[PDB]
Structures are given as structure tokens and as C-alpha cells.
Design an enzyme around this catalytic site. Structure first.
Site, short mmCIF file in Angstrom:
data_model
loop_
_atom_site.label_atom_id
_atom_site.label_comp_id
_atom_site.label_asym_id
_atom_site.label_seq_id
_atom_site.Cartn_x
_atom_site.Cartn_y
_atom_site.Cartn_z
N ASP A 1 0.72 -1.24 -0.04
CA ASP A 1 -0.02 -0.06 -0.02
C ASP A 1 0.71 1.25 0.05
OD1 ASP A 1 -2.88 -1.34 0.73
OD2 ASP A 1 -1.14 -2.06 1.79
N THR B 1 0.36 0.92 -8.19
CA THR B 1 0.56 2.19 -8.64
C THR B 1 1.75 2.77 -7.87
OG1 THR B 1 -0.24 4.56 -7.78
CG2 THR B 1 -1.22 2.66 -6.69
N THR B 2 1.97 2.69 -6.70
CA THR B 2 3.06 2.91 -5.85
C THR B 2 4.35 2.20 -6.43
OG1 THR B 2 2.38 2.10 -3.90
CG2 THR B 2 2.18 4.16 -3.86
N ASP C 1 -9.45 -4.12 -2.77
CA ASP C 1 -8.88 -3.11 -3.78
C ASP C 1 -8.55 -4.13 -4.90
OD1 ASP C 1 -6.91 -0.71 -4.00
OD2 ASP C 1 -5.57 -2.42 -4.99
#
Lengths: 532, 532, 532
Positions: B60, B93-94, B386
Site C-alpha cells: 500500500d 500504482t506506488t 482493492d
């Protein structure tokens, strides 16, 4: 760039004046240099900080002036020169504050050891009178003749320099401006385009919001989420007679039979909401709009319900154009002209989706879209409006002349030429100044090869009657000639004021070579001074 | 990983800029490295602390960014790049923020001693234009053709990596998603699945909560504990006329005979509760539902009673789907469509047991179960959503291409190949960047043997027209080929933005090699700077 | 003139360099301006202080440099440029340090934004090569032809400006110089004139001390006060065999009959003093001269006695010229050539009266007189020697040219003319510098009407082949023409070096736009630096 934060000494002022002007020059020169660094066409990145905050920017003068709160009673004084020019906004203004803030150097030195700047003042104003003269076409090459859409793309070429699309975001923002130009009130036009960008999932190419955004709200909960084609309604604020006006002083003295009074009041608002539905309009907009009981009635009779305080939306609504001049209390049947019925594309991005239908009418329309995300967009979003707004003011008549592209470098040779007139003192600090107005368009140059003046002789070649234009920074070093976007500015006007702000401020900035003060408090907290 | 908490010096900013960008790079690089350590497919454990608190997490980005509050005016600035990509959520994404945050290194050095990054910007955007190009199938092997349930298991393979069931928790969470995909509003679908897991004795395998949880409460005390098959009722908020609206101003002036008025009021609510029972519905749901007197009546006539404030439950109820659009004050007979009658399996785990009956209708249903206990579950519970949500956004049309499994490593060889085009400056920092887009899929590699690049030559073999896939970390080092779960991502889209967030942020992150500020307060408490 | 004592911050150095050169310029410019204020022909009063002390001065560079101990690592560095020129002393030197210290301004700015000063260096040296060229007569008007006594009065016109006699103190100090010129060793000549003035009751006109002062002492007490015409003697140090050399280790073991040994020793020195009297010389001079017993003998035989330590008097005696090469222990009869016999005019002013007789021989003579009292005289006393000494060095061959009187203003027009040669870069900072060498002779101007440049056009008139001279400050504003004392300097040489010290120092003063240091101790007490 030394003496951090005005060196942080000289706490509350004192001392003698004749070294103080040199001190004023030092203070004005430093802030002018820090801004000059990558400002205007150089334009890129100037890093900010603070105690927990963010202000990333480029080409903006008001933002740099928003900061460095004081640091000397000289810096604050000349923040306003940028500020005075900030009225009738733009970004090329502060780049012009740099040109004004520079020659004063060869001028402060100038006639080294002369008490009379009174001569230099006659000069700057003379340069301004020449400014109104060059306002009339001096360029000749572009002149004024070119498609106005061209001058529009020109502003999109500049944007805010840090523009994502080094090209055609143009007519997108422009059509809305082409509409805005029809309004031409001088400000109400910039009020319609007003507000946002982003507020969408991801980034990429999107624009316009065509005829009407006018509102911000998912619209209160009942079912704003549903009911596409809600219809034309334009009620902009329903309030209820909540048994209040009253205060009475005393009321409802006797007990028991209140079973009527309770039911009758809810009844009083149900009839007024049923009549408003008779309009067959249905959609509700309202700041002070909560009418909970006859809202459930309005829910049945008016798709949804809304609830709070956005007044700017009502003025934006006056732009939606649903005749909403009269809206107090009750019974008005005649007005309902706001667009068509199609409304609210639901739930994209997040929070709220709101844009009204479109039954054609050019102006009084909004301008905002998904474009890009907040911080990267904040800057590109605003600079493009400055692009849409400044052009909007000058597009009207009274002006004709190609701007930028060193049109200035030789405008100044004319200024140096007028020096032929032997008297404005002798030195013609007006001319000596002109020399600077010639050196500045070069300070713009930024670099190219290395340093400069290499290209100045290049500009000298072909202007006697040929004209100036095209000097660029992109890999191809353009001496002069077409579509290098010349000096994007035509609207060339801004120079009219960019030239003036100088002559006025620079004069009272100087001739002020006395005391520099030993001031007693007018603000707070201050008392006494320390140094003698 | 030195300079604890931004070394904790340089209190409120100052100094010169050209060493500051290297400083910005240092600040952005460090936070990017700490996150890179076991993030994405590496994914495992990152230990947290604070003054009395807990935040265990894996894969995350929003959580890591939730922290390290500031430490330099550079770290905060680029928290948002992760944040911008966080919209349209995901965990990959990260990991992509790391790829963007890496090459900028060979790019900051790049043409060591060149002021023009203006060339590098043309490159990153070009890589993005190539990104929209590779969006169209470049993989060829999987292409897009495969069972959608496959892509669903793929997301369950990733989960949040720290997944308890290194396998089929899949279609459990997916059927609910298969239902969610029918809604496809872009967000209301993620709103239904919303809420919990756990809340059960012990741990193990359990899931779904099939059609409706919609409420949270043991339901107020009378006997919610009993009355199985309470029935279809869907009253969602009964309020009483508690002799209040009034305030009167004055009321009940005369004494004695009040024996009527007291009995009549209780009578007024008893009749309204008797009529609501006529619906033969019985079950009551209500935020502001306390009607104590005609609640005892409701107890006789409506199994039980409830009492307070859960609005999200009503919107969740709109999903239960009992038509509850209109519910104000009195008399509405037409609506009652919410499921069947079977309700509340009593007293397991603890506190409250609540899930409604089921009279079939696919969507607008809940999703939560006993699964595992709070802390060990918190993480597996969320990551799987998610998993259910990100796939939900991309499942719609407009995309086709196998993701991961180094599909990127050679997507980049194409980028290095386009470098054939001689001009984007020369260096083609676009290509030099491509080299990094090639080195990053390798940074993913994590280890295998030791270090890497040993397997890169392995990927080079068989892709000219063969295609990339299968590179794994499990004991079996898979060069390429099938069911290694390839690059689980197809929905490959996220890369579209993962690629973009880079080009935009990385550019304004650089070219910002000036000042780095000496900021005066905008936040608080700040004043003056110390260093000169 | 702000930032008292180098503002007293930046304790032990640090920070970045490119703003530091501007800082070096600021430090060098300030000290150069404070000195410029009334220095050279402006020359008058510069007030001094300190913690209990006095240093009143005018036209002197070494004195100003004696002070302001440090204030920045730039001020100390360029104290030496004045110091280097101070060798081969003069006062016009530091006025020339001002000319060098000024243009560097239009030169530091110069090509604003160019890293290469390497061009400017080629220029200053070129100006110096032109300097050796103008050394050969460029004046034409005075040329070199004029009475040398004229050039002598010229130096007396300048004196130290603060001269009491704005005229003919001239040939007084000059005849002694006319004698000094015969010696012409380059330094031994300035050694003879060396020492004092004043030391007399009251003030007024007195001078020369003709042929010999050579000693300072009322001469020890016996009767130096009396015995006029003491005579030619030149014993310069009688020492006694005070029973010491000895230390023996053991001596005089046996008692009683010591009545001989005591009387015999006094006898041993009485015979050596009687033989020295045989010379018929009589006068005694001696550092280590106390011979108390045979001193009473010397009192009878040698007018008086003297007693202690003035060695410089013996070297001054070598100038008295009494052959005093050999003077150890005993018996030397051949030498005694020191003047005549008339000695010591007793008791005027106070303390000591001492000047020897005169039996003609031109040089190796002293120079000091009553003149004026200590503080008012200290300054006029020294400046006049600088007047007698500097002229003494240049009076020898190898030079011919009228100096001052703007001979420089047009020497520089030649420098500006050579700029015709297109390449020394382009800008010809050599020429741009020349412009300053033209502006400086004007900075000298001081005022006249008000400010200046009014008279510059005046100098331009009549020099094409006419020649420059006569620009003065006295009420009569002299454009050009004779006996305005032109440029008193011819000896024009000093400019040769005044021109050179510039080119060398000014170059390494610049091009030094790096670091500015963050120095660790070499001196003491220092350690660590504070700012980052």
C-alpha cells in the site's frame, strides 16, 4: 543573493540616509534578481517552502510578491509596483518589472555624484510618451494583420510556459473566450470562465464544459443520482415558513386540540410546493433550500432536492440565464428560460457531478474540465485563464502592433536615436536608459550559445526598415522571420503599462536618498531603535 | 537510509538553489527507496510505530504516504504524485511511483552539466504516447483472450501479497464482484461490497454475506434476539410527534382536567403505529426511531424495535432495495419490496448479529464475513477489496493486453528502438529513460539467484515476436511461458496512468534547481530563517 | 559606507562562491571609497580613533592600511596591493590604488554573465605596456625640460597637502636632497635625512641642521653643558676592562696586601685614557661608554663624558664621516676626520641639545629642526620627507614626461583609441577600462562647480597635439596652461608601478568567484563554521 531574509539585522530602523538609497537599490535589486531567475519566457521553476504549505509557480509575479513579507522598508514599497501592474492582470508584467528594476542601476550610478535625478524623470516619462507612439505599429512585418485565432494560439504558446501541451490546448480555451469576447464587459466575461479544471479520474485531454456548469453539488440526497432529463426548472432558493418570523411573545395558550394546527402547517407548505410543480419545471437549486416535509412532496414532484449556501452559483446561474431576478416568497409564473432538460452525468471521479443541459445560447457559460490532477494542474489551469483573460481585455480596438521578438530591442534604438535631441540635461539618461531597454530584451535571451550579445548584433542586422521578430530559445536559434511565434503578444498592449509602472515607481524609488528612517511605531510591536 | 527524519536540521528553509535540486533528488530518492524495499510484488513487511498506535501494511502506497509528515519541502510535494495515481485506486500504482522515481537519477545526471531538461520532458510524454500505443495488445501470447474468471483469480493471486490463502479466496470475493460488475456505475459498485470481514468467533474459511447485510445492530432491546422470519418490512425511520415542534410560546394555561390531554397524545401515536402494522411488514429500522410508548405497541406489532443514527445503512438499504425514497411523517402504503422474511441469526461471536433475508435480486448487495480476526484480517480484508474494486473499473471495454511478466521489459526495448529516430535532442534521454523502464521491471525481480541481470538476458531470449510473460519469484525461476500467472494484470490498465503520473511530476520535480526557498510563514508557527 | 566593521557577522567563513565575488567587490569597493574620500589631492582629514591612541593623517595609504585589521578575507588580501606599491614609497600610490579599485566595477559587471575575465587580463597588462610607452614623453608641453629645482618645488607644493606652508618650505628640504642626490645609493640617501623636526621652543620657520646632527644626547653629566669648541674627536665607544672577562673560576686567594691590586687596576685604565687624549681630540661618543674612574680623568682630558646605547647614531656617525671603521679595544692613531671643533648649542627647548661642528663636506649629513610642535608637525614633518625621498629615487635617468594635470585623461584617450584594434575579445574591456582611466582623473577633480564632467569636455578641448596640464582646485578653475604647477609629478615615474599594481592584483582579485571559503583554522582561535 546573500544576506538571507534581508540579513535579519537592522531590527526596527534608524541611521543616516545617503548610503540608504544605495541600500534601497540593494534591496530592490536582490528581489528583482531572484525573480528574474527563470521568470517570464525563462519562466521555469522557482522553489517555495514555509512552515507546512505549498506554492509551486512559474511566470507569476503576484505569487512571488505574496511572499517575502517584508525584508527592508524598500522591498515592500516596490511590491506594489508589480501590484499596480497586476491590476489588468498578466504574467509579462513582472518580467517588465525586471526591465524597470534593472536600468535604475546604470541610472543610480549614472552621473556619479549628482544630486539631481530630476533629469532622469523627464527621461522615463519621455520613453513612455514614445511608448504610446510605438503602440501605433512599429513592427510592420506582422503589423496587426493576421487571423485573431493566431494571436489566440500565441497566448497558448506562452500559457504559463510550464504548459503540459506545448501547443494546441489553444482554441479549446479560446472558443470559450470567443464566446467571452461577445460579452465584453471587461470583467463579467472573466467571471463566466471562472472556477476549475481537473475534478476527474486520471488526466489527459478534455475541455470546455460547453454551455453550463453553473452549479457545484451532487444535489442533495433523494435521488439526484438518478432522473436524467430532470428538465428546465430554475428555482434558485425555496425557503419555508417554518412557523418562524413569529417570536410572537406568547402563542398557543390553550391545550388539547392541537391536532389541527400541526397538520395545517405542513399543509401550508405542501400547497405552495404543489403550485411550483405546476410549472412543470421540476429541478430545484437552493442555498437556503431545506423544506424537509414539502421536499418529500418535492421529491415526488421535482426529481430531487438540494440544500446549501453557494451564492456565486446563483450569479453563475444569472449566466445559466434562467431569468432569476425575482424569486422572493411566492407566486411567480412568467420566468423559466434556462437551457433544456438533460442534467447531471452521475458519479465519475468522485464527490459531485454537476453540469446542466444545453439549449443553445453562446455566452454566460462556464469553463472547467477533468484536464489534469490538482497540483500539476493548479498551475496549468490558472495560467491558461490568464491567457484567456488578458487577451480578452486587449482584443478590443485602440491597438495595432507586433509584440515581443525584440520589437522592443529596436523600439529602443529609436529611443537612443532621439538622444539626437541634445537636451534632457545632456547625458540623456533617457538615452542611457534606452540602452538598458536594449539590454533587457537581451536579458530575456537567457542563454542560447552562452551569455549573450552574440545575437544582439544579429538583431541589428535587418531592422532599419525590415522589422524585428522571431528571436527564440528552442534549439533553432531564430534571428528573425516568421512563425517562431514572433512575440506572441499582439495584444501588444500591456507594454503600455509595463512601460509606465517603471517611470512612476523608479522615480520616487530614487531621489529618496535621505534618512531611510528611524521610525517610531505605527504598527506593532515596536518602540525605540538601537544604534547610537 | 541515513539522515533520520530528514536529518532534522534546516529548520524553516533558506540558502541557494543549484545544490538544492540534488537535495530534492536526495529527498525524493530516499523515500522512494524505503518504499521500494519490499513493496509491490516484493511487497512484504514494512514496520511501523508512533506514539501509541498501529499501522501494519503491505503493497500500500497511501499508508506509507499517510506518514512521514514532511521531512523536507520535497517529500511532501511528491507524496501527491502517488496520491494523484491513488485516485482510481490500486497497489501496483506506488510500485510504478518507484519506476518513475528511479530513472530521474540517470536523467538528473544525464547530460551532466546541461541546464535544459526541456528535452527530457519531450521524452517522458513520448513514452506515454507509446503507452497508449502498447495499451493495444503488444503481449500477443495471452492477448486479451482468456476467461475473465482467470483475470479474477489473477487479482486473487496478488491480493495484497500478504494473503493468507495463496490461492482461491478468488471467486468468493469475485461472485460479489461479478454482481458488482452488473451495476457498473464506476463507484456505487464499490459502495455495496463496502464494510467488513471478521466479526466472528475464531478464523478460517467463510465469505459472501450473499445478498444483504445492510444493517449493523442487534436491533434495539425488546426481542430482536428472537422472532426469526420477522418479515419483509422496510420502515427506515419512525419519529414521533413528541408534543414537540411546538415551543408554542405559551400552552396549557388552565389546571385540573389534563387527564384527557395526557392520554390522548399517547393515543395519537398508537393509531399511527397500528396503521403501519396494517402493512403486515413488522420489521423496523431507524436512526431517529425511538417511540417508546407506541414501540411497546410496535413490540406487540412488529417483532422488535431499533434506535439510532446509521445513515450509511439507509443508503445500503437503498441497495437492500426496499423502495425507501419517500418516508416522511405519515401514510404511505405502496412500497415494500425488500427481500423475504428470514432475519437475524442470533448471538454468534458477540455484540451484534445482523443480515437480512433473501428473495433473489443480484446486485445492491453487501460483502463481509467472519474470515479472520481484526489485525491479521484488517490487511487481508482490504487488499482483497482493492482486488475486487480495481478490476471492477478496468473490466469495461477500451483495453486489451497481457500485463506484467516483463511485458514491460520489451515494451521498453521498443522505446529504446524508437531511439532510432535521431532527434529528441540527441541523447534521446527518452531512450536513456527507456533503459531504466527496462531496468525497473528488473528491480521488481527482487533476487532469485542473487542481485540480477542474470535473468534479463533470459528475457531477451524469445521476444522478437514471441512475447513476454511468466517471470516469477517462487522457487521455480520461470523464464517465460504459461500459468506462472504471467503478469496478473489484464486489466493491464493502470499502467496508462502509472506511466503518466511519472512524466508530469518528474518534470516539475526537476527544472526546479533554483532557490529551494527561504520561506516566510504561510502556515505556523514560523518567522525568520537561520543561516546567514 | 554601511555594514559597520564588515557588519561584524559571518564569524569564521562558509557558504557558496558565485555571490561571494560580488561580496569581494563589495568589501574592496567600500574600503576603496572610504580612502578615496579626501585622499590624494583631495587629501584632507580622515578621522581616527581606537582604545586610547592617536593617528592623524592625510594622503597616506600605509596608515589607513595599518588599520581596519581584517573585516572580510577580501580587505586584507588587497591591503597588500597598496603595500606592494608602498615599496618605493609615495602618497600618489594609494590614490592610484583607488583608480585600480574603481573600474573593476564596470569590469565586474562588464559583459554581464560571462565566466571569462581571461579577456580583461589581456587588457590591463596591455594598458601597462602602453604605460611604459607613455613613460616616454607624451605631455610635450613641459616635456622633461624645466629646472630640476622646479620639480623640487612641485613636490613641496604637494608636500602632504596638509602643509603649513602652501609654498616654499621647498629648497630648504631640497638642498639637503640636492646633497642627498649626490650620494644616490637608492637608500643610504634617505637614511641621512632621517629622524626629526620640532624639538624646539615654539614653532615657525627653521630648517636644515646643515651638515651634522648625528647624535642625540645632552651628552652625559660632567659638563657637556659647557666647553664650546670641544673639538674634532670621534671615539665612538670606549669600554673598560672592568676586571671582567675573567670569571676565573678562582682568583685572589691570599689576604692582606691587596692595597696594590686595587690601585693598579684603576691605573690600567688611566693610562689608556691618557693615551687617547694624546690625540688632542677630546670629545667622546659612546653606547657602552661608562668608564667612571678614568672618565673623571677623561673629564679633565676630554671636555665631558657620555654613556648609552644609540647604534643608529654610529651609522649616522659613519655619515658624520669620522673614519670609525676600526674601534676595538686599544691603540689606533691614524683616524680622525670628523668635521671641526664647534659643538653643542646648550639648553634650548629642553632635554637635549646636540649638533656637531662643520668643516665642509656635502653629504652624509642630517636633516631636522625646530619647525613645529609634535602632533601638528608629525604629519608635515613626514610628508615632506616622502617629498624628499620619492623625488630622490626618480631623479635619476630613464624617465622624461610631464605628470598629472590630466596628462592621464588623454593618455587614456589613446587607450580608447587603440580599441580601434578590433580584437582583445571584442568589448575591449581594455578600452572599457580606458574609459575608467579617463573617469578617474575626474574623480580626482573633487568638485569645482559641483559634481563633474563639466570640466572634462574642457580638457577634451586643446589636446589633439596640444597637451594636457593645469587642472586645479584652487578658486581659479584652470582648464590647462602653465604654472598651475601642472601635474607636479615629473618624476612622473610611480605611475609605471601605479599602473602595474592594478593589472596584477585586480585580476586575481577577480576570476575568484568560487567558494570564498569555509576555512578550518590555520590561525587561532577557530574551529567549525556556522551556517548549515
Amino acid at each position: 543573493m546573500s544576506q538571507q531574509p534581508g540579513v535579519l539585522p537592522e531590527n526596527m530602523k534608524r541611521y543616516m540616509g545617503r548610503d540608504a538609497q544605495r541600500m534601497n537599490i540593494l534591496a530592490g535589486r536582490i528581489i528583482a534578481e531572484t525573480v528574474r531567475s527563470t521568470l517570464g519566457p525563462k519562466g521555469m521553476d522557482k522553489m517555495l517552502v514555509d512552515d507546512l504549505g505549498d506554492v509551486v509557480v512559474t511566470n507569476d509575479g503576484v505569487t512571488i510578491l505574496r511572499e517575502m513579507s517584508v525584508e527592508h522598508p524598500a522591498a515592500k514599497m516596490l511590491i506594489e509596483v508589480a501590484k499596480t501592474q497586476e491590476k489588468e492582470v498578466g504574467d509579462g508584467t513582472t518580467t517588465a518589472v525586471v526591465v524597470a528594476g534593472e536600468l535604475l542601476r546604470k541610472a543610480e550610478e549614472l552621473l556619479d555624484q549628482n544630486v539631481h535625478p530630476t533629469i532622469v524623470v523627464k527621461g522615463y516619462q519621455a520613453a513612455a510618451q514614445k511608448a504610446q507612439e510605438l503602440l501605433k505599429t512599429i513592427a510592420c512585418e506582422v503589423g496587426a494583420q493576421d487571423k485573431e485565432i493566431l494571436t489566440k494560439i500565441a497566448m497558448t504558446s506562452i500559457t504559463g510556459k510550464g504548459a503540459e501541451k506545448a501547443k494546441e490546448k489553444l482554441a479549446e480555451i479560446i472558443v470559450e473566450a470567443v464566446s467571452a469576447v461577445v460579452d465584453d464587459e471587461g470583467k463579467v466575461d472573466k467571471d463566466l470562465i471562472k472556477i476549475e479544471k481537473k475534478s476527474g479520474a486520471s488526466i489527459d485531454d478534455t475541455e470546455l464544459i460547453k454551455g453550463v456548469l453553473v452549479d457545484k453539488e451532487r444535489v442533495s440526497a433523494q435521488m439526484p443520482k438518478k432522473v436524467t432529463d430532470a428538465k428546465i426548472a430554475l428555482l434558485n432558493c425555496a425557503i419555508e415558513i417554518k412557523e418562524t418570523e413569529t417570536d410572537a411573545e406568547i402563542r398557543i395558550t390553550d391545550p388539547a386540540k392541537l391536532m389541527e394546527f400541526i397538520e395545517q402547517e405542513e399543509k401550508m407548505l405542501k400547497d405552495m410546493v404543489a403550485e411550483i410543480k405546476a410549472s412543470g419545471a421540476n429541478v430545484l437549486f437552493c442555498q437556503k433550500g431545506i423544506d424537509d416535509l414539502a421536499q418529500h412532496y418535492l421529491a415526488k414532484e421535482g426529481i430531487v432536492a438540494a440544500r446549501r449556501v453557494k451564492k456565486s452559483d446563483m450569479e453563475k446561474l444569472a449566466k445559466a440565464t434562467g431569468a432569476n431576478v425575482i424569486t422572493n416568497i411566492k407566486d411567480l409564473s412568467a420566468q423559466d428560460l434556462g437551457d433544456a432538460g438533460l442534467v447531471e452525468e452521475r458519479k465519475i471521479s468522485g464527490d459531485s457531478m454537476i453540469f446542466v443541459e444545453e439549449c443553445k445560447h453562446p455566452k454566460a457559460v462556464t469553463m472547467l474540465i477533468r484536464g489534469t490532477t490538482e497540483h500539476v494542474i493548479e498551475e496549468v489551469a490558472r495560467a491558461v485563464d490568464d491567457a484567456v483573460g488578458v487577451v480578452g481585455c486587449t482584443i478590443e480596438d485602440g491597438r495595432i502592433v507586433s509584440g515581443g521578438g525584440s520589437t522592443e530591442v529596436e523600439l529602443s534604438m529609436k529611443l537612443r536615436e532621439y538622444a539626437e535631441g541634445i537636451s534632457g540635461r545632456e547625458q540623456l539618461a533617457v538615452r542611457a536608459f534606452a540602452d538598458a531597454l536594449e539590454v533587457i530584451p537581451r536579458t530575456l535571451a537567457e542563454n542560447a550559445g552562452l551569455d549573450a550579445i552574440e545575437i544582439l548584433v544579429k538583431v541589428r542586422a535587418a531592422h532599419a526598415s525590415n522589422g524585428n521578430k522571431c528571436a527564440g530559445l528552442n534549439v533553432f536559434t531564430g534571428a528573425v522571420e516568421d512563425m517562431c511565434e514572433n512575440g506572441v503578444v499582439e495584444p501588444l498592449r500591456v507594454k503600455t503599462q509595463a512601460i509606465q509602472s517603471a517611470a512612476e515607481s523608479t522615480e520616487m524609488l530614487l531621489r529618496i536618498d535621505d534618512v531611510i528612517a528611524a521610525e517610531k511605531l505605527r504598527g506593532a510591536p515596536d518602540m525605540g531603535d538601537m544604534g547610537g
